[PDB]
Design a protein around this ligand. Sequence first.
Ligand SMILES: [Zn+2]
Ligand SMILES: [Zn+2]
Length: 64
Amino acid sequence: MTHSDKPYKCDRCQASFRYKGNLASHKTVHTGEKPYRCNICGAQFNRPANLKTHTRIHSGEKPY
Ligand SMILES: [Zn+2]
Ligand SMILES: [Zn+2]
């Protein structure tokens, strides 16, 4: 058993909410819809998975 009654909570800080609209309202507080940005190229990503795959090219440790 575990505590869980806020399906719509900010997965960035302690803040939590039971409504999706409220979450969006709270998101305005952070002011920065750019979690990850590639300085090398300039691409913006909302997920680290894509960034990890993107780093694949930048992965300098085996040129050939
Ligand atoms: Zn937050
Ligand atoms: Zn890049």
